[PDB]
């Protein structure tokens, strides 16, 4: 349960240790993922002092036949297996249509190298969801020790419309406008051969483990209390469903999840997701990540 610092990324460090993925959105969102040079020129990525900002374009009214709203998807150059990743996050994207995520996967063999969604939601709908998406023969037990609430317990992407096996965080301030009003917080994910765990601690938590909040070079997860989400190996060989994964942080719009009319309008958002995203640039001023650091331990 003891790990030691492997990477400590702050501010401009992200520009040399991650790349921007200028790809068509795998989730079919109303987005134009720009490359690193484009992001920096357009100030969609800003990386200086103790701050990384990743944001959507909030000035352009989109041509409906042209590409989607400019945004970014950054990916660590390094990959990881058994490790702990800690994200010190001051702000996450908000706004109707938004679908931000901080997560890990192996894109090159998806879903067979696994996927763990650490921070994720849509359309400002708290709470946070933590979810695995895998190949066949990977499920979760109905009862296991965690503070969050399991929804779906089958992780296999070819089941249930690829909901994955998810857990909802117990507090509103785990996600969205609630999280942002509270100044964010910390997300930590420990992955071993035997399990994946995620902890969320709000910015104002009186009980955030010092390991998580201060980022010393040595940590011990035994001292961290019960995880928010727990994915044991009872009904899933975790180690055989996950391989070496990159860390990804992104913001898309609409698409497979956020763009479903029932979900978008269910969230109180007007009209169609694509129309809204095209025509309301100012509504995306607060569609930004503000990240203080990301640390990895091995
Ligand atoms: C590209 O896009 C970027 C990013 O959006 C644009 O950058 C912004 O530029 C604008 C205009 O120039 C800046 O706006 C001004 O900011 C003034 C204040 O700046 C200083 O304070 C900011 C707030 O700091 C506090 O909060 C944060 C947490 O959010 C703490 O980390 C920090 O320590 C401070 O904590 C104190 O206050 C809180 C309460 O709020 C307490 O709880 C604490 O205990 C503390 O008492 C801060 O964000 C700024 O940091 C930036 O700059 C420093 C270098 O000085 C760097 O180290 C950081 O990494 C970061 O980059 C700064 O210290 C404000 O008074 C004024 O009214 C105005 O709003 C804005 O700060 C920029 N945002 C950044 C840099 O993140 C940029 O303009 C654009 N570029 C182009 C080319 O267009
Ligand atoms: O549990 C919270 C929340 O999860 C939502 O799902 C999130 C994931 O949504 C994914 O897209 C899916 C699509 O994959 C799915 O289409 C399937 C096809 O991909 C596949 O080829 O064929 C089958 C039919 O055999 C399709 O079902 O369609 C659903 C919508 O019906 C999409 O949501 C994203 O790719 C993935 O990144 C997300 O994790 C649920 O949609 C939501 O209901 C639930 O509340
Ligand atoms: O063409 C066949 C089929 O494609 C479908 O879409 C999926 C994508 O949803 C999927 O997206 C993955 C993400 O959900 C996950 O979060 O990240 C990974 C890594 O970036 C993505 O690959 O990608 C797969 C494989 O390319 C696609 O098949 C449509 O949903 C489906 O309707 C269509 O028939």
TrEMBL record:
<feature type="domain" description="GH16">
    <location>
        <begin position="1"/>
        <end position="266"/>
    </location>
</feature>
<protein>
    <submittedName>
        <fullName>Putative laminarinase</fullName>
    </submittedName>
</protein>
<feature type="disulfide bond">
    <location>
        <begin position="96"/>
        <end position="269"/>
    </location>
</feature>
<dbReference type="GO" id="GO:0004553">
    <property type="term" value="F:hydrolase activity, hydrolyzing O-glycosyl compounds"/>
</dbReference>
<dbReference type="GO" id="GO:0009251">
    <property type="term" value="P:glucan catabolic process"/>
</dbReference>
<feature type="glycosylation site" description="N-linked (GlcNAc...) asparagine">
    <location>
        <position position="43"/>
    </location>
</feature>
<dbReference type="InterPro" id="IPR050546">
    <property type="entry name" value="Glycosyl_Hydrlase_16"/>
</dbReference>
<feature type="disulfide bond">
    <location>
        <begin position="138"/>
        <end position="236"/>
    </location>
</feature>
<dbReference type="Pfam" id="PF26113">
    <property type="entry name" value="GH16_XgeA"/>
</dbReference>
<feature type="disulfide bond">
    <location>
        <begin position="155"/>
        <end position="165"/>
    </location>
</feature>
<keyword id="KW-0378">Hydrolase</keyword>
<dbReference type="InterPro" id="IPR000757">
    <property type="entry name" value="Beta-glucanase-like"/>
</dbReference>
<keyword id="KW-0732">Signal</keyword>
<comment type="similarity">
    <text>Belongs to the glycosyl hydrolase 16 family.</text>
</comment>
<feature type="disulfide bond">
    <location>
        <begin position="254"/>
        <end position="273"/>
    </location>
</feature>
<dbReference type="InterPro" id="IPR013320">
    <property type="entry name" value="ConA-like_dom_sf"/>
</dbReference>
<keyword id="KW-0326">Glycosidase</keyword>
